[PDB]
């Protein structure tokens, strides 16, 4: 009973790992350099096939005809001993369907993008009047709570004055796994006003990238046919794999108690 149900669930999770790991490699392939329309279409077709397999695993993994990986099994309990209350409980309340895994917040420490800028150490636009060192790039790094930390072209943290002066005062994430939430990256006009029109446009596009990568789709809605979509897929799959690994670990802990 309990041991066999746990094995059936764990088998399904291993199938799911295979398909998620496959989407990761496809996303890597799609993000390495420029792609023709035909190559982008072909790569996304492969992702769609894997999404279909994820949905099959979620809708069809079953024990004696009863689904166990679509959330519908709930919490199961098994008697292991003679003590009243000597039971092992197994939480199968979370669906593994593509619509219900991935998404969420980017894990901490990931570089979301790099913006070319022209500012002084206080975050003011660089000019012939400026002194000290010029900041020429800003790397935007996730904090695991839907917000950001920032380094310069030499990987040194921006001063707190420069962070505030360029990005405003809502950069720190406040989300939790239980209640996710997302900051909106906003770049000052002063960060790029000294640069060419083309550099200003490039920065705007990078900020849009970063904001999209910060809010990845669930596995169901991944599309790797654009660079931003491929980057969103990498984050989303990292998160989906973490969800699957957490669940595998809990199944294992339950098996151990039998």
Numbering used by the authors: 69 to 326
Reproduce text from the manuscript describing this model.
To date, one of the main candidate antigens is bacterial flagellin (FliC), which assembles to form the flagellar filament that supports bacterial motility. Interestingly, FliC is recognized as a pathogen associated molecular pattern (PAMP) by Toll-like receptor 5 (TLR5) and by nucleotide-binding oligomerization domain (NOD)-like receptor C4 (NLRC4), activating both innate and adaptive immunity. Flagellins vary in dimension (28–65 kDa) and contain at least two essential highly conserved domains, D0 and D1 that mediate assembly of the flagellar filament, and may contain a second (D2) or third (D3) variable domain. FliCBp constitutes a major target for vaccine discovery initiatives to elicit protective immunity against B. pseudomallei infections.
We also report the 1.3Å resolution FliCBp crystal structure as the basis for in silico epitope predictions using two diverse computational methods. FliCBp (residues 25 to 378) was crystallized using the sitting drop vapor diffusion method, as described in the Materials and Methods section. Electron density was visible for residues 69–326; the first 44 N-terminal residues and the 52 C-terminal residues were absent, however experimental epitope mapping revealed two immunocaptured peptides containing N-terminal residue 37 and residue 361, therefore the residues that are not visible in the electron density are likely to be present in disordered regions of the protein. Typically, removal of the D0 domain is necessary for successful crystallization. This was not the case for FliCBp where, however, the first 44 N-terminal residues (corresponding to the D0 domain) are not visible in the electron density map because of structural disorder. Overall, FliCBp adopts the canonical flagellin fold and presents two domains, a conserved D1 domain (residues 69–167, 287–326), and a variable D2 domain (168 and 286). D1 forms a helical rod (α1, α2 and α5) involving residues contributed by both the N-terminus (residues 69–170) and C-terminus (residues 285–326), a β-hairpin domain (β1-β2) and a 310 α-helix (η1). Domain D2 (residues 172–287) contains a three-stranded antiparallel β-sheet, two α−helices (α3 and α4) and two 310 α-helices (η2 and η3). Domain D2 is connected to D1 via two anti-parallel regions that house two short 310 α-helices (η1 and η3) that interact with each other, thus stabilizing the relative positions of the two domains. F96-111 is housed in domain D1 and is composed of two short α-helical segments at the C- and N- termini of α-helices 1 and 2, connected by a short loop. The third predicted peptide F270-288, is located in domain D2 and is formed by α-helix 4, the 310 α-helices η3, and their connecting loop region.
